[PDB]
Design a protein around this nucleic acid. Sequence first.
RNA 1: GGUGGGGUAACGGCCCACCAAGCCGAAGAUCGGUACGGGCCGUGAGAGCGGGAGCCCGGAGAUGGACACUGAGACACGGGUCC
RNA 2: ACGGCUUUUCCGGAGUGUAAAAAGCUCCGGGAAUAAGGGCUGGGCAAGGCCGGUGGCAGCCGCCGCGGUAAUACCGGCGGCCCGAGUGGUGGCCACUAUUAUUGGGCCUAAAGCGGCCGUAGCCGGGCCCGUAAGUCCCUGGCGAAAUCCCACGGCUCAACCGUGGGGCUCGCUGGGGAUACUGCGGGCCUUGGGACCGGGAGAGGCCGGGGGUACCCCCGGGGUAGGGGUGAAAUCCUAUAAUCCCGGGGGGACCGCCAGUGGCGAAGGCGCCCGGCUGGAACGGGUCCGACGGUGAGGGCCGAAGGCCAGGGGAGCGAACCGGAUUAGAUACCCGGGUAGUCCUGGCUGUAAAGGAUGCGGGCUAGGUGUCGGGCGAGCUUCGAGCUCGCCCGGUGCCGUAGGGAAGCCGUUAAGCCCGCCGCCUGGGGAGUACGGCCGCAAGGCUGAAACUUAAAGGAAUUGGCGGGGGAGCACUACAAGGGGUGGAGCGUGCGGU
RNA 3: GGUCAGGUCGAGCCCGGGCUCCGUGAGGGGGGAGAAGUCGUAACAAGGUAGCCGUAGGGGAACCUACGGCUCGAUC
RNA 4: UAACUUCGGGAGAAGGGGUGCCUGCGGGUGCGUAACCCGCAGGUCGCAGUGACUAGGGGGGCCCGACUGUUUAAUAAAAA
Lengths: 157, 129, 144, 36
Amino acid sequence: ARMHARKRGKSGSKRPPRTAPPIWVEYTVEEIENLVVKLRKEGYSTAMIGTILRDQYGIPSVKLFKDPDNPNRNLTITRILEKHGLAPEIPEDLMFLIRRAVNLRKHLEQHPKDLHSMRGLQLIESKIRRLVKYYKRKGKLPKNWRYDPETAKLLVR
Amino acid sequence: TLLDPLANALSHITNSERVGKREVYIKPASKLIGEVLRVMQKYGYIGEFEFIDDGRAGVYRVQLLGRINKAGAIKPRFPVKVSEFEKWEKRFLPAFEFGILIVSTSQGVMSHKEAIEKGIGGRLIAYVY
Amino acid sequence: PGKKAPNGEFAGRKLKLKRKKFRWSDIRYKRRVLRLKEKSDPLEGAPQARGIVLEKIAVEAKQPNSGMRKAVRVQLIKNGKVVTAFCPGDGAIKFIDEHDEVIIEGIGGPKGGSMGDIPGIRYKVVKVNRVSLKELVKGRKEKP
Amino acid sequence: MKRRPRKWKKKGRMRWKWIKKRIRRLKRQRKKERGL
RNA sequence: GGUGGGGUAACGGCCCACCAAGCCGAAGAUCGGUACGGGCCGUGAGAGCGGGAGCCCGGAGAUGGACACUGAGACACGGGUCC
RNA sequence: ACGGCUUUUCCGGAGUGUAAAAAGCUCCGGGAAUAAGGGCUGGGCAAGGCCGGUGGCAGCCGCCGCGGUAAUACCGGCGGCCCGAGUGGUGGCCACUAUUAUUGGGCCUAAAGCGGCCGUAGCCGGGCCCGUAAGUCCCUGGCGAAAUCCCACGGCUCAACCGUGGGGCUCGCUGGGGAUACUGCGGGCCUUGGGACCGGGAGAGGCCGGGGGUACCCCCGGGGUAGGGGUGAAAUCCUAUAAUCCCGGGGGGACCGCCAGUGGCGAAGGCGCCCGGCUGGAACGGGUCCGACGGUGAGGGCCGAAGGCCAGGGGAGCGAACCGGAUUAGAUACCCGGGUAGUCCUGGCUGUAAAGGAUGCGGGCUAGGUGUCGGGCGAGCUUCGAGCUCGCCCGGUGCCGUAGGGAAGCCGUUAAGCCCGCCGCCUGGGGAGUACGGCCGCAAGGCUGAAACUUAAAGGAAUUGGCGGGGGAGCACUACAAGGGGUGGAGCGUGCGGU
RNA sequence: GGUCAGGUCGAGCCCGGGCUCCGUGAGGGGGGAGAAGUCGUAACAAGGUAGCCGUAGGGGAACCUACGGCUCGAUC
RNA sequence: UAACUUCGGGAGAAGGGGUGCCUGCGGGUGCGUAACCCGCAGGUCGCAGUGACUAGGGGGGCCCGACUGUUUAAUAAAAA
């Protein structure tokens, strides 16, 4: 069930079993990488880049194409972006959570009596702390890194 | 959340047998589940079983022949020696040599009878009778 | 509601602590460990005690029973505590006088307490003046 | 005060609300007598 | 805990002179209650619960404390000094 | 009862025995001679429907329970049943007790799920590949004194006892070799669990600002006279200083009528007039992104109806306390007129409810049927409507019900069924949520929390009856309604109570 | 081995502060047992004003009232 | 370093140890071996080292008034 709301929502994507790219894809792996890079330059996040590739360009998923530089792995949006040096400095989901947390704090300071929104902020910060702990364990971010709203203001800015 | 696929599969098999089903699906699949199914088929407690790939852990399709009285995983997986099998047999089975205790040993997973024949111990992973 | 926990292989510490915690809800175990009975036992854990008869009294049988049960007040030589001892027998009371040396013994009852329809009495007289009360009442011996 | 729902039943007993009020009165009297 | 020494039959904060802030603890320190520990015994189908005086091994005591002499061995139940 | 036999044991002797004795062992003489008691007798539990004594007194009774003038239950006699050199009484330990539950207990209604959620240690943790072997399993050396324990043989007549061999016990420690299925550890690759993001929609989910709805209360101006209000009936009360009632205006303070629903949203408490701004969560459709980031969570943090308290405003209607009028034997109440705190707003504290689904939370599986809310898909209608109807999928919210579960009531894919996890709570009823101790709060109060003593029961579900100032159906001149004659007032006949 | 000085171990005694336990002490508080006591009738039926939980205030005593809540509440 | 408490206090509660002179070092501010102050080691004398001078006695119950303050100049300073 959901982490907090505790209700079972089984809505999601139904990926068919595949082992190779479709035969009707009109772009090569190099062209796919170029499209990913140009979209990232435009400014879309990884999820948006994947959605745009699926919709406009008819690319079901970059994960289907093998990695030309490492035969032991398949391609990925983040892997391509880090190959070109465009990978996000901070994980995207954590950054999104921090951004909306600082926005919620801005709202709460003006509306101190919004206790329900305060509880929402508490849940958001709990999610942020969980992700921070996981990223520290995996070594993605420095061990001395800590979440503090005052610094998060500048980080979001 | 999901913790013991083996226990889930064995409980599902038991419930399906009680209801009188002829076919069952086990998900997620694993090598341990595959080997346990192999042992059960060897001893004749189940019928034909096959593996199905779906881009995920995989699924097992199993035919039930209405021969299982009760199958269940053992938790915690108690270690056991060659000479310390009678107490577990009494605990988990109705009579002597009635069912089988599926044990994971250093030479693969096998029934406690095969383990005693080979003169080795292991850890009790399941039982079925 | 839910599988009783803990059940892990490495949860022996928690299981032991749970058992230790919940063993205190058992009255018998708590009493035995704290030695509560010996703290307030007039006999100090002795099977029998000795005392001097102070006076002879009677009590009323509980409802619906009706009758006079004749007992004595005995002062223990161990610590001077005063207790009530029932006299068993059809005419046991007349065989006991004041300032007599008697031996009292627990009265068979639930939880080693009172018996029958006479609560408040926990002991019965066995020997008076170093002579068996049963023998005296039955008539085989003379009171010294 | 702790909850003993078995006490709310009125079979052969006074109302628990008023027993509770009386107990509070007794506690307050004892506290006054002690001088707290 | 360290450095340098004393003492011991022996290593040791055992003690001494100086240098540091170390060491223990909710996995229960400290404090309080109880108790000589074990081989074993009583009970139960077993898991287990309870006791651990008599026989064996080890430890302490000789009215309550504190001290020394002789000897390989004692600060000594039928040896010594003081309260 | 008669006729025979033995001397285990007792008594007296001879040897042997002993350091010397004694005890034992062989033998001679006399002889059934020298030797059975304790509890119990109503059930549990084997044993009396026998006689005498006592008549709620003596007494018995571990528990149930007997005894009040026919006692199988007390005392005594005669019988009998158990064990037997033993048999009874009292205290303690174990089983009884799955009433301590790892094996292996419970928590809707009987004891018990924190009022609710977030989360730290701990515990439990998706699939595949490679590597090490810490846990684990197998083999082999050094140990774990003896006595004690079990088996066989041998010596005291067998046995108890002891000796000779084998095994076990000391819950285990340690030196090495072999395996990597599982767990641990290091590395690699995945998407199923959980998160992030986009799209059209749903909702009394919150906070802020603006605009309204009648209704109610007060005041003024006009009309209009005598009652108004209230109860079972009255009274208090308002009213000639013009009440109640109708009309034209002004002021104020709370609440959003029907629509409204087993409807929706929120973790819970709770949230319903309309437009605008800020904001939390969830469902649906997603070949979108990360790649186990997850579950529960002792300590700890936040929220939390009503009521209460502190400071400042407000106060229409209701209304604890209080003052009056009624009823009653009394009425400190129910009933009726007034009424303070409070109920409302702005900053705080309190942290309490039958805070209840009396049901903790996440996961897999176990027939259906039928209502309704949100979303998506297909088809047919359409007045082309964000409209209507049918079917299907996921997520919510109700009812019936199969398998099965339960003491039953009842639950039954929204489990109270089976399985894998985590925390909290219960161990007969009172004493008692009390006493003492400690922390928190201004206070009220909140949290933690026993013993002495007492008790055989307390408690739950359900059945038959009986009752109800419960609902129905009927019936009756020992009921009524409509009637006729009477008794109750006087004298006397007769029968009762009293003297 | 006597005397003086110094250094150590240290019994015993006195004083102050703790901790644990034990005894009693005028009077007071509630608790449990008791037999046929006095006052009223609070609960069980719609128990005669439905019962019950939070809080608050009153009353000889069971009890009464106000705000919010549950049905473990009958009849329509 | 106690009961109590209005948490401010009670409090210098109570109670215990030291204190002279001489010979040398270390430390603070300081340019300084200027000036002021703070420790350390050793030797030594007396009955006594704040040696004179200066310089609190303390604790436990009860009544009254909360406290600071004022009052009968010339017998009452108090609970008024």
